[PDB]
Amino acid sequence: SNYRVSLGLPVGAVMNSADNSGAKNLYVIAVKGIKGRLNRLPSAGVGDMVMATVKKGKPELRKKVCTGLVVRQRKHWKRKDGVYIYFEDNAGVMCNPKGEVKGNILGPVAKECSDLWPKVATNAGTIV
């Protein structure tokens, strides 16, 4: 669907779960789509679907391997119109395998992430 954004969330990067469902952060354990390349860490850009666990949140969901969208990151990526952009914090939002955010997203959502996934646009307040 969308382009290559600069990947700045490797495996082992905690990010703030901008989602009104119960988490306080998200620890990315692998990214869906990364294959191969000996000794390279799977990085997540924005728009990526990550497999993540929660290290801080409601205890009824705390040791499961859940799915999340990276909706903003502070590694600066240039859009292909020339303008760069970088957010304030890394962030995530929990979903299903299909990519259905069932909660409400808070904070600005990058519009390289409201592209591939429709329901990340329909729960975002600010799409930037």
Binding site: D81, K111, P118, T122, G125
Partner: protein, 224 residues
């Protein structure tokens, strides 16, 4: 009427096209021409403009336009508004609001008489929306929202909320807004409403996975 449709088999057509009382916008869809099937249903009136806004394919819940004003954020391009202002003949005042706190489709649910408002809309937006839409605005959230757009779908003679919405909100939303309500949820996989259906006084392009008995439920308030 209340017809199934999908945008690239990701059935949520309620965001990639807005069907307002005038000027149905549609997304770009660098694929099969998505606007062609909706133009086979809207060649009679309500011209389709095939414009993308802000670079992004969503226009229905990133632009929240009425019959009397279309809205575009501060991320939109001057050439995209130079296409939007030209693609439709003169009936509207399309107003690019200088808001940047939000994305404008998900935060105002609009209607030809009285619209809705995400609470911290920063009253500059309130005055400019009373100028260019001329509608009353109410900074309300339903029991399943704080972002009151795109959890509810607003039209004339009809609206919708969730069955996770309390009755106390539905009665006051039938009282204050003066629009009848059904608590049905479009597209039984998800919860949100205005990602599933976009409504005119004539039709409602509806997501493809929607069950037909629920399609009858929402068409028995959208049509009549």
């Amino acid at each position: 009427m209340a017809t199934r449709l999908q945008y690239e088999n990701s059935c949520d057509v309620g965001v990639f096209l807005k069907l307002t009382n005038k000027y149905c916008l549609v997304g770009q869809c660098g694929s099969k021409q998505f606007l062609h099937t909706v133009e086979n249903r809207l060649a009679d009136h309500i011209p389709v403009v095939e414009t993308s806004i802000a670079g992004t394919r969503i226009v229905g819940r990133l632009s929240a336009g009425n019959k009397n004003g279309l809205l575009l954020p501060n991320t939109c391009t001057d050439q995209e508004l130079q296409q939007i202002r030209n693609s439709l003949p003169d009936d509207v005042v399309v107003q690019r609001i200088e808001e940047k706190f939000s994305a404008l489709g998900n935060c105002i649910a609009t209607n030809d008489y009285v619209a809705l408002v995400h609470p911290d809309i920063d009253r500059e937006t309130e005055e400019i929306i009373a100028d260019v839409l001329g509608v009353e605005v109410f900074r309300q959230t339903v029991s399943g929202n704080v972002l009151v757009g795109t959890y509810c779908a607003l039209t004339n003679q009809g609206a919708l909320v969730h069955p996770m919405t309390s009755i106390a909100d539905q009665d006051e939303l039938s009282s204050l807004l003066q629009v009848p309500l059904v608590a049905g949820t479009v597209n039984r996989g998800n919860e949100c409403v205005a990602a599933g259906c976009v409504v005119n006084d004539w039709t409602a392009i509806v997501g493809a996975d929607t069950t037909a008995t629920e399609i009858s439920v929402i068409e028995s308030i959208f049509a009549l």
